[PDB]
Amino acid sequence: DTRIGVTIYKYDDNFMSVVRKAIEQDAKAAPDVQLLMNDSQNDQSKQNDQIDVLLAKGVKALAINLVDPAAAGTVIEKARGQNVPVVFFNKEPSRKALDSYDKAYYVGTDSKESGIIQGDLIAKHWAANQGWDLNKDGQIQFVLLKGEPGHPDAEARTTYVIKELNDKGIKTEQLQLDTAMWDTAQAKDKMDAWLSGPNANKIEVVIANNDAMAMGAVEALKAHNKSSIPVFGVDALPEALALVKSGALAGTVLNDANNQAKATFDLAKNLADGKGAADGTNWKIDNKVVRVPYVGVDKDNLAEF
Ligand SMILES: [Ca+2]
Ligand code: NA
Ligand code: NA
Ligand code: NA
């Protein structure tokens, strides 16, 4: 069987756990492929040792989710010894590293696109629901529940949901913006304070950097009999999709783990077989990179889940 070595930066990450399982499913579906999977336990030195072991097993391709993006050159130089192709995924190597090897590729998507897709989702529903503009001023008065300060996904989602709305021509007015540390209970307590204060009846849209905080806000809204106010999240978690179905959550955003897995597997298998990376597929490889769009989820495409 053709062996493909895979390193996941750490198995105790929810998103990469979904990607990992999906890649394992995709390989199971390819009878002539054997996946050699590894948990790097958030230690690049351990990942490097794991790659030395994989190369001693004759893998024909490596799919590597780096712990440290700056280690891409080290990994490429190890793979080059046996001319083994490397498909990096989810953590992006530098452009210099990708350009240094003809058989290096990347599959992943900048986190700011999750804020841009959320902003487009809110614009889509705002334009379709005039009644949400409680003061009829054409602007969205919102509150935002931020992830942990300084976390790259909290910073990007907070900055870009608002830049995207404003770039689509929708002015916004930030009535409140605080962190709830990605947590449902903290978000319920923060939203409850806002609903007990001066802005309670002026808030038109609640924006959260993830679904857990969106769900805490939905609970506070129900407690205050203010469920008329729409809430948007990010993650498309199953418990959040159940609230999209019930009408309690207006929308959320999928980070498409299945397609990151599929693109990584399809490119790695083609390269292991000595074929063009995208042969037989419709992936777009632009300067060695496949981008996998985040996707807005609401009642239009909820049946897909
Ligand atoms: Ca308004
Ligand atoms: Na996560
Ligand atoms: Na991403
Ligand atoms: Na609501």
Coordinates of C-alpha atoms and ligand atoms in Angstrom, one line a residue:
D1 CA 0.0 0.0 0.0
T2 CA 1.1 3.6 -0.7
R3 CA 2.0 5.1 2.7
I4 CA 1.2 8.8 3.5
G5 CA 2.6 10.2 6.7
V6 CA 0.5 12.8 8.5
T7 CA 1.4 15.0 11.6
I8 CA -1.3 16.9 13.5
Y9 CA 0.1 19.7 15.7
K10 CA -1.9 18.5 18.7
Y11 CA -4.8 16.0 18.9
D12 CA -6.4 18.0 21.7
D13 CA -7.6 20.8 19.4
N14 CA -11.3 20.6 18.3
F15 CA -10.8 21.9 14.8
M16 CA -7.9 19.7 13.9
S17 CA -9.7 16.7 15.5
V18 CA -12.4 17.2 12.9
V19 CA -9.8 17.6 10.1
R20 CA -7.9 14.5 11.3
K21 CA -11.0 12.3 11.4
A22 CA -12.0 13.5 8.0
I23 CA -8.6 12.8 6.5
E24 CA -8.7 9.3 8.1
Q25 CA -12.1 8.7 6.4
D26 CA -10.8 9.9 3.0
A27 CA -7.9 7.5 3.2
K28 CA -10.1 4.6 4.3
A29 CA -12.0 5.3 1.0
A30 CA -8.8 4.9 -1.0
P31 CA -8.0 1.1 -0.8
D32 CA -4.4 1.4 -1.9
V33 CA -3.4 4.0 0.8
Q34 CA -2.1 3.5 4.4
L35 CA -2.1 6.6 6.6
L36 CA 0.6 6.8 9.3
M37 CA -0.9 9.4 11.7
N38 CA 0.9 11.3 14.4
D39 CA 0.0 13.5 17.4
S40 CA 2.8 16.1 17.8
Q41 CA 1.5 17.1 21.2
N42 CA 2.1 20.8 20.4
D43 CA 5.9 20.2 20.3
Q44 CA 7.8 20.9 17.0
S45 CA 10.8 19.0 18.2
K46 CA 8.6 16.0 18.7
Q47 CA 7.0 16.6 15.2
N48 CA 10.5 16.7 13.7
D49 CA 11.4 13.4 15.3
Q50 CA 8.1 11.9 14.1
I51 CA 8.9 13.1 10.5
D52 CA 12.4 11.3 10.8
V53 CA 10.5 8.1 11.7
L54 CA 8.0 8.5 8.9
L55 CA 10.8 9.0 6.4
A56 CA 12.5 5.8 7.6
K57 CA 9.1 4.1 6.7
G58 CA 9.2 5.1 3.1
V59 CA 6.3 7.3 3.1
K60 CA 5.5 8.5 -0.4
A61 CA 4.1 11.9 0.7
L62 CA 3.9 13.9 3.9
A63 CA 0.8 16.0 5.0
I64 CA 2.1 18.2 7.8
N65 CA 0.2 20.5 10.2
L66 CA 3.1 22.3 11.7
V67 CA 3.4 23.2 15.4
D68 CA 5.8 26.1 14.6
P69 CA 5.2 27.6 11.1
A70 CA 8.9 28.7 11.0
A71 CA 9.9 25.0 11.0
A72 CA 8.6 24.6 7.4
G73 CA 12.1 24.9 5.9
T74 CA 13.4 22.2 8.3
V75 CA 10.6 19.9 7.3
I76 CA 11.2 20.6 3.6
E77 CA 14.9 19.8 3.9
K78 CA 14.1 16.5 5.6
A79 CA 11.6 15.6 2.9
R80 CA 13.9 16.5 0.0
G81 CA 16.4 13.7 0.9
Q82 CA 14.0 11.1 -0.7
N83 CA 12.2 13.6 -2.9
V84 CA 9.1 13.2 -0.8
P85 CA 6.3 15.8 -1.5
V86 CA 5.0 17.9 1.4
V87 CA 1.4 19.2 1.7
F88 CA 1.4 21.6 4.7
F89 CA -2.0 22.3 6.1
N90 CA -3.8 24.7 8.4
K91 CA -0.6 26.6 9.6
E92 CA 0.9 28.5 6.7
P93 CA 4.6 28.3 6.0
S94 CA 6.3 31.4 4.7
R95 CA 6.2 32.2 1.0
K96 CA 10.0 31.7 0.9
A97 CA 9.6 28.2 2.3
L98 CA 6.9 27.2 -0.2
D99 CA 8.9 28.6 -3.1
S100 CA 12.0 26.7 -2.0
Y101 CA 10.8 23.3 -3.1
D102 CA 8.9 22.2 -6.2
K103 CA 7.0 19.6 -4.2
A104 CA 5.8 21.8 -1.3
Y105 CA 2.1 22.9 -1.2
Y106 CA -0.2 24.5 1.4
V107 CA -3.9 24.0 2.1
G108 CA -5.5 26.5 4.5
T109 CA -7.4 29.8 4.9
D110 CA -6.5 33.1 6.6
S111 CA -8.6 33.5 9.8
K112 CA -9.7 37.0 8.8
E113 CA -11.9 35.4 6.2
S114 CA -14.0 33.9 9.0
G115 CA -14.7 37.6 10.1
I116 CA -15.3 38.7 6.5
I117 CA -17.8 35.7 5.9
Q118 CA -19.6 36.5 9.2
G119 CA -19.9 40.2 8.1
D120 CA -21.3 39.2 4.8
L121 CA -23.8 36.9 6.6
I122 CA -25.0 39.7 8.8
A123 CA -25.3 42.0 5.8
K124 CA -27.4 39.4 4.0
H125 CA -29.9 39.2 6.9
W126 CA -29.9 42.9 7.8
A127 CA -30.8 43.8 4.2
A128 CA -33.6 41.2 4.3
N129 CA -35.0 42.3 7.7
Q130 CA -35.7 46.1 7.8
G131 CA -37.4 45.7 11.1
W132 CA -34.1 44.9 12.7
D133 CA -33.1 48.6 12.4
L134 CA -34.9 49.6 15.7
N135 CA -34.1 53.3 15.4
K136 CA -34.5 53.5 11.6
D137 CA -31.1 55.2 11.2
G138 CA -29.7 52.8 8.5
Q139 CA -26.9 51.8 10.8
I140 CA -26.4 48.6 12.8
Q141 CA -26.2 49.3 16.6
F142 CA -24.4 46.2 17.8
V143 CA -22.7 44.6 20.7
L144 CA -19.8 42.2 20.2
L145 CA -18.6 39.3 22.4
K146 CA -14.8 38.9 21.7
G147 CA -12.7 35.8 22.2
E148 CA -9.5 35.9 24.4
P149 CA -7.7 39.2 23.9
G150 CA -4.6 38.8 21.6
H151 CA -5.7 35.3 20.3
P152 CA -5.3 35.7 16.5
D153 CA -8.9 34.4 15.8
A154 CA -10.4 36.9 18.3
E155 CA -8.5 39.8 16.9
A156 CA -9.2 38.9 13.2
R157 CA -12.8 38.1 13.7
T158 CA -13.5 41.3 15.7
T159 CA -11.7 43.5 13.3
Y160 CA -13.0 42.1 10.1
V161 CA -16.7 41.5 10.8
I162 CA -16.9 45.3 11.2
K163 CA -14.6 46.2 8.3
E164 CA -16.6 43.9 6.1
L165 CA -20.0 45.4 7.1
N166 CA -18.7 48.9 6.6
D167 CA -17.0 48.0 3.3
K168 CA -20.4 46.6 2.1
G169 CA -21.8 50.1 2.8
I170 CA -23.5 49.4 6.2
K171 CA -22.4 51.9 8.9
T172 CA -22.2 50.4 12.4
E173 CA -22.3 51.8 15.9
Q174 CA -20.5 49.8 18.6
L175 CA -22.7 50.0 21.7
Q176 CA -20.6 47.5 23.7
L177 CA -17.6 45.3 23.0
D178 CA -16.0 43.1 25.6
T179 CA -14.3 39.7 25.9
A180 CA -16.1 36.6 27.1
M181 CA -12.9 34.4 26.6
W182 CA -14.6 32.1 24.1
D183 CA -16.9 30.8 26.9
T184 CA -20.6 30.4 27.0
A185 CA -21.2 31.2 30.7
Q186 CA -19.0 34.3 30.6
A187 CA -21.0 35.5 27.5
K188 CA -24.3 34.9 29.2
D189 CA -23.2 37.0 32.2
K190 CA -21.8 39.8 29.9
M191 CA -24.9 39.9 27.8
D192 CA -27.1 39.8 30.8
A193 CA -25.3 42.9 32.2
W194 CA -25.8 44.7 28.8
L195 CA -29.5 43.8 28.8
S196 CA -29.8 45.3 32.4
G197 CA -28.3 48.6 31.4
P198 CA -29.1 51.7 29.3
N199 CA -28.6 50.1 25.9
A200 CA -30.9 47.2 26.4
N201 CA -33.6 48.4 24.0
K202 CA -31.2 49.9 21.5
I203 CA -29.1 46.8 20.7
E204 CA -30.0 45.6 17.2
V205 CA -27.6 42.7 16.5
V206 CA -25.3 40.6 18.7
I207 CA -22.1 39.5 17.1
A208 CA -19.9 36.9 18.7
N209 CA -16.5 35.6 17.8
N210 CA -17.7 32.0 18.3
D211 CA -20.8 29.9 18.8
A212 CA -20.2 29.3 22.5
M213 CA -20.4 33.0 23.2
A214 CA -23.3 33.4 20.8
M215 CA -25.2 30.7 22.7
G216 CA -24.6 32.4 26.1
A217 CA -26.0 35.6 24.6
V218 CA -29.1 33.7 23.3
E219 CA -29.7 32.4 26.8
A220 CA -29.4 36.0 28.3
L221 CA -31.8 37.3 25.6
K222 CA -34.4 34.6 26.4
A223 CA -34.1 35.4 30.2
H224 CA -34.9 39.1 29.4
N225 CA -37.6 38.4 26.9
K226 CA -35.5 39.9 24.1
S227 CA -35.2 37.0 21.8
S228 CA -36.3 39.3 19.0
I229 CA -32.7 40.5 18.8
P230 CA -30.6 38.4 16.3
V231 CA -27.4 36.7 17.3
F232 CA -24.5 35.5 15.0
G233 CA -21.7 33.1 15.8
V234 CA -18.8 31.3 14.3
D235 CA -18.0 27.5 14.2
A236 CA -21.3 25.8 13.0
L237 CA -21.1 23.6 16.1
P238 CA -24.0 21.0 16.2
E239 CA -25.6 22.6 19.2
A240 CA -25.5 26.0 17.5
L241 CA -27.0 24.5 14.3
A242 CA -29.9 23.2 16.4
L243 CA -30.5 26.8 17.4
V244 CA -30.3 28.0 13.8
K245 CA -33.1 25.4 13.2
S246 CA -35.2 26.6 16.1
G247 CA -34.7 30.3 15.1
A248 CA -32.8 31.1 18.2
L249 CA -29.5 31.7 16.4
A250 CA -29.6 33.8 13.2
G251 CA -26.5 32.4 11.6
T252 CA -23.0 31.0 12.1
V253 CA -19.9 30.4 10.0
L254 CA -18.3 27.0 9.1
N255 CA -14.5 26.5 9.0
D256 CA -14.7 23.8 6.4
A257 CA -12.7 21.0 8.0
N258 CA -14.0 18.4 5.6
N259 CA -12.7 20.3 2.6
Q260 CA -9.4 21.1 4.2
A261 CA -9.0 17.4 4.8
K262 CA -10.1 16.5 1.3
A263 CA -7.8 18.9 -0.5
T264 CA -4.9 17.8 1.7
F265 CA -5.6 14.2 1.1
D266 CA -6.2 14.6 -2.7
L267 CA -3.0 16.5 -3.2
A268 CA -0.9 14.2 -1.1
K269 CA -2.3 11.1 -2.8
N270 CA -1.7 12.6 -6.3
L271 CA 1.9 13.6 -5.3
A272 CA 2.6 10.2 -3.7
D273 CA 1.5 8.7 -7.1
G274 CA 3.8 11.0 -9.0
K275 CA 0.9 12.9 -10.6
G276 CA 0.2 16.6 -10.8
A277 CA -1.0 17.8 -7.4
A278 CA -4.5 18.6 -8.6
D279 CA -4.9 15.8 -11.2
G280 CA -8.4 14.4 -11.4
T281 CA -9.7 17.1 -9.0
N282 CA -11.2 20.6 -9.2
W283 CA -9.0 22.2 -6.5
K284 CA -7.5 25.5 -7.5
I285 CA -3.8 25.6 -6.7
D286 CA -2.7 29.2 -6.8
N287 CA 1.0 29.6 -6.4
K288 CA 1.2 26.3 -4.4
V289 CA -1.8 27.2 -2.2
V290 CA -5.3 25.9 -2.0
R291 CA -7.7 28.2 -0.1
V292 CA -10.8 26.6 1.4
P293 CA -13.5 29.2 2.0
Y294 CA -15.3 29.7 5.3
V295 CA -19.1 29.3 4.7
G296 CA -22.0 31.2 6.2
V297 CA -24.7 28.9 7.6
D298 CA -28.3 29.9 8.1
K299 CA -31.7 28.6 7.0
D300 CA -30.8 28.7 3.3
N301 CA -28.2 25.8 3.6
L302 CA -29.0 24.4 7.0
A303 CA -30.3 21.1 5.5
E304 CA -26.8 20.3 4.3
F305 CA -25.8 19.7 7.9
Ligands
CA1 CA -30.0 51.3 13.7
NA2 NA -10.9 25.9 18.5
NA3 NA -8.1 29.0 8.8
NA4 NA -32.8 36.2 18.6

